[PDB]
Write an enzyme that holds these catalytic residues in place. Structure first.
Site, PDB file in Angstrom:
ATOM      1  CG  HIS A  40       5.996 -10.060  25.473  1.00 36.67           C
ATOM      2  ND1 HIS A  40       5.144  -8.822  25.640  1.00 36.67           N
ATOM      3  CD2 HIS A  40       5.691 -11.037  24.829  1.00 36.67           C
ATOM      4  CE1 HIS A  40       3.863  -9.285  25.112  1.00 36.67           C
ATOM      5  NE2 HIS A  40       4.128 -10.699  24.437  1.00 36.67           N
ATOM      6  CB  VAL A  57      -2.344 -19.409   1.744  1.00 39.46           C
ATOM      7  CG1 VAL A  57      -2.718 -19.433   0.426  1.00 39.46           C
ATOM      8  CG2 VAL A  57      -2.927 -20.545   2.441  1.00 39.46           C
ATOM      9  CD  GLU A  62       1.153 -13.089   0.842  1.00 44.32           C
ATOM     10  OE1 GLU A  62       1.411 -12.990  -0.137  1.00 44.32           O
ATOM     11  OE2 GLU A  62       0.355 -13.769   1.327  1.00 44.32           O
ATOM     12  CG  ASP A  84       5.904  -5.688  26.656  1.00 41.77           C
ATOM     13  OD1 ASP A  84       6.877  -5.910  25.838  1.00 41.77           O
ATOM     14  OD2 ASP A  84       4.858  -6.533  26.834  1.00 41.77           O
ATOM     15  CG  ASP A 171      -8.297 -10.468  26.667  1.00 45.75           C
ATOM     16  OD1 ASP A 171      -8.085 -11.137  28.114  1.00 45.75           O
ATOM     17  OD2 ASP A 171      -7.983  -9.367  26.342  1.00 45.75           O
ATOM     18  CB  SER A 172      -5.464  -9.708  22.768  1.00 44.98           C
ATOM     19  OG  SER A 172      -4.900  -8.891  23.698  1.00 44.98           O
ATOM     20  CD  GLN A 174      -0.230 -17.591  26.405  1.00 42.60           C
ATOM     21  OE1 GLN A 174      -0.317 -18.794  25.951  1.00 42.60           O
ATOM     22  NE2 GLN A 174      -0.532 -17.301  27.570  1.00 42.60           N
ATOM     23  N   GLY A 175       0.106 -14.955  21.051  1.00 43.93           N
ATOM     24  CA  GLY A 175       0.290 -14.910  19.635  1.00 43.93           C
ATOM     25  C   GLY A 175      -0.363 -13.479  19.183  1.00 43.93           C
ATOM     26  CB  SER A 177       2.522 -11.075  22.223  1.00 42.66           C
ATOM     27  OG  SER A 177       1.877 -11.918  23.184  1.00 42.66           O
ATOM     28  N   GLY A 178       2.376  -7.986  20.989  1.00 42.41           N
ATOM     29  CA  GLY A 178       3.210  -7.173  20.125  1.00 42.41           C
ATOM     30  C   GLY A 178       2.350  -6.449  18.950  1.00 42.41           C
TER      31      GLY A 178
END
Ligand SMILES: [Ca+2]
Length: 223
Positions: A40, A57, A62, A84, A171-172, A174-175, A177-178
């Site tokens: 998704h 930042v 990174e 999914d 909980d987890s 939106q965002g 996700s994955g």
């Protein structure tokens, strides 16, 4: 992540941010060339951001690497969210170090009660909206089949599990996700869906990675 805590910079080194000009989903680094996420989360033009803490930042650890290929599961059904899961191949291999590391795949399906770490840059509110700049973390147990299936009758497949707290508050969201659900040092789940976030008797639902290990390994080995 609702009701969690600030992880601490680079404490979850397999956590990635998928960026298309902005963060939109998490994922997990499974080897130097491959990321697992939710189907998704699929879109074209993904850049994988590794070694992130504050996603707004540049802090110096990174790696930003474009995707060369996305592979949504052959049987992903967007209506039910069954299967999914998606694989993303990096245009160049990530440099592995303390702050950028792979997470192992599971060798079995974890039992109810097993404690897991869920992480992400998703919404931190159960009512309303607040997106954090730094990585958030949540410790949550795997829930029993019956707890999961009672909470969502007719909607849990053999490829999903629930983890979290039936009382709500944690909980987890939106965002997230994955992103990863890691239990005993293995990637057991992928943040998939839920009814609102941190609602009472509505735990998070996660793609059951143990069912996909064969597909993951075969797909990576041929691509
Ligand atoms: Ca950053």
């Amino acid at each position: 992540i609702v009701g969690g805590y600030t992880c601490g910079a680079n404490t979850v080194p397999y956590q990635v941010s998928l960026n298309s000009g902005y963060h939109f989903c998490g994922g997990s680094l499974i080897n130097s060339q491959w990321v697992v996420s939710a189907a998704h989360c699929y879109k074209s033009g993904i850049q994988v951001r590794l070694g992130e803490d504050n996603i707004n930042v540049v802090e110096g650890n990174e790696q930003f690497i474009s995707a060369s290929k996305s592979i949504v599961h052959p049987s992903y059904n967007s209506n039910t969210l069954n299967n999914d899961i998606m694989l993303i191949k990096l245009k160049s291999a990530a440099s592995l170090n303390s702050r950028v590391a792979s997470i192992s795949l599971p060798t079995s399906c974890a039992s109810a009660g097993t404690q897991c770490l869920i992480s992400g840059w998703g919404n931190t509110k159960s009512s309303g909206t607040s997106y954090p700049d730094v990585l958030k973390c949540l410790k949550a147990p795997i829930l029993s089949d019956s707890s999961c299936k009672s909470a969502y009758p007719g909607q849990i497949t053999s490829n999903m599990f629930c983890a979290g707290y039936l009382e709500g508050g944690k909980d987890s969201c939106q965002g997230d996700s994955g992103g990863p659900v890691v239990c005993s040092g293995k990637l057991q789940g992928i943040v998939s869906w839920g009814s609102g976030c941190a609602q009472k008797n509505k735990p998070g639902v996660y793609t059951k990675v143990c069912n996909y290990v064969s597909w993951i390994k075969q797909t990576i080995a041929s691509n």
